[PDB]
Amino acid sequence: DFSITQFVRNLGLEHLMDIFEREQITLDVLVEMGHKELKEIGINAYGHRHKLIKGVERLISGQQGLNPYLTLNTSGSGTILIDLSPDDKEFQSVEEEMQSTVREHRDGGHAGGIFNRYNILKIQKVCNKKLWERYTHRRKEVSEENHNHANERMLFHGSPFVNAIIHKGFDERHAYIGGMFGAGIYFAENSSKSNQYVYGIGGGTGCPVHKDRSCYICHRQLLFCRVTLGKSFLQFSAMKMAHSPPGHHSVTGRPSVNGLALAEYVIYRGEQAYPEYLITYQIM
């Protein structure tokens, strides 16, 4: 509580400290308080409130280049997870999309295992204000370049680093370097294709307890994510590219003939995706 103590002492208002001590007023709280709030906590003299407000203004605006406000506004930031009720239609819709997009793969379930259906344990909504704001800023920028259309989609993503993504967001500096379409971030319409990557490329070595890629006990996690494609380049063959083709904001391809197989997408900028839903499940 020393920062507010110094601030109040510099104004000659140390005699008010008692109030600030009882009301748990820290400097970050104080810089958001006007005449009304200050009157609520017992600062009755107009001169004291005037001095406090003027000092806050001289700090936040007078030294804007030092960014004192950002230093004081780190509280409350971070991710929270909100559990969906299985009886609500949001949970049911997410589950229906998860289940209805399973299919057989070219390999006999070597990477993701053998299964026809999932057992969904829980689905969570990922809430992070800074990452959401970054995503929306990028979405606006892309829409302005694509005749007012973001071309937004919902796609699955499987990664052994789901926790890092949900806490720090998608990052093209951790792209899939060895991917068929180059160093980007990959998403799939089929949930099974993303499930093939839950433990790593080619399924890695399986679940950490069993070293089994087809384990039916160990809990898996997928992300159902908001992805901005904008103008998407249609790619028919493997091509290693570091960034999007000129004039485009993503790449879309299909590694299998027409049928039960759905499309797949690559974005080369981390701010074009947001991990909206975290799904915990088992394969049956």
Ligand X SMILES: COc1cc(-c2ccccc2)ncc1C(=O)Nc1ccc2c(=O)nc(-c3ccc(C(C)(C)O)cc3)[nH]c2c1
Binding site for its own copies (CB under 8 A): 89-90, 93-94, 97, 144-149, 151-154, 224, 226, 231, 257-258, 276-277
275 binds ligand X (CB under 6 A): no
Residue from 7, 91, 135, 197 that binds ligand X (CB under 6 A)? 197
Q: Is 215 annotated as a binding-site member?
A: yes
Terminal CA-CA length for the chain: 54
The structure tokens 């909504």 sit at 125
Per the CB < 8 A criterion, the answer to whether 170 and 273 are in contact is yes
- What is the identity of the amino acid at 211? K
- Please identify, among the stretches 10-18, 137-145, 188-196, 224-232, the one whose residues bind ligand X according to the rule CB under 6 A: 188-196
CB of 185 to ligand X, least distance (A): 7
220 binds ligand X (CB under 6 A): no
For residue 196, the Cα-to-chain-centroid distance in whole angstroms is 21
For residue 40, the Cα-to-chain-centroid distance in whole angstroms is 38
Distances (CA, A) of 194 to 12, 175, 243: 62, 15, 22
Q: Is 210 annotated as a binding-site member?
A: yes
Q: Tokens for 54, please give them.
A: 């003027």
Distances (CA, A) of 20 to 76, 120, 161, 251: 21, 49, 44, 56
Q: Is 207 annotated as a binding-site member?
A: yes
- Among its own copies, Zn ion, ligand X, none, the one that 237 touches (CB under a kind-dependent 5 to 8 A) is ligand X
Residue 28 or 152: which CB sits closer to its own copies?
152
**Beta partners for 192?**
none
Please list, in sequence order, all residues whose beta carbon lies within 8 angstroms of the beta carbon of residue 242, skipping any fewer than 6 positions away: 182, 183, 268
- Among Zn ion, its own copies, ligand X, none, the one that 215 touches (CB under a kind-dependent 5 to 8 A) is Zn ion
- Please identify, among the stretches 57-65, 122-130, 149-157, 201-209, the one whose residues bind Zn ion according to the rule CB under 5 A: 201-209
141-169: burial string, b at 16+ Cβ within 10 Å, e else: bbbeebeeebbebebbbbbeebeebbeeb
Per the CB < 8 A criterion, the answer to whether 7 and 19 are in contact is no
Residue from 45, 81, 114, 201 that binds ligand X (CB under 6 A)? 201
- Among its own copies, Zn ion, ligand X, none, the one that 207 touches (CB under a kind-dependent 5 to 8 A) is Zn ion
Residue from 30, 84, 111, 188 that binds ligand X (CB under 6 A)? 188
CB of 78 to ligand X, least distance (A): 22
Provide the binding-site residues for Zn ion, judged by CB under 5 A: 207, 209-210, 215, 217-218
Binding region for Zn(2+): 207, 210, 215, 218
Q: Which amino acids are annotated as binding site, given as ranges? A: 207, 210, 215, 218
Binding site for ligand X (CB under 6 A): 157-159, 161, 174, 176, 179-181, 186, 188, 193-194, 197, 200-201, 237-238, 253-255, 264, 266
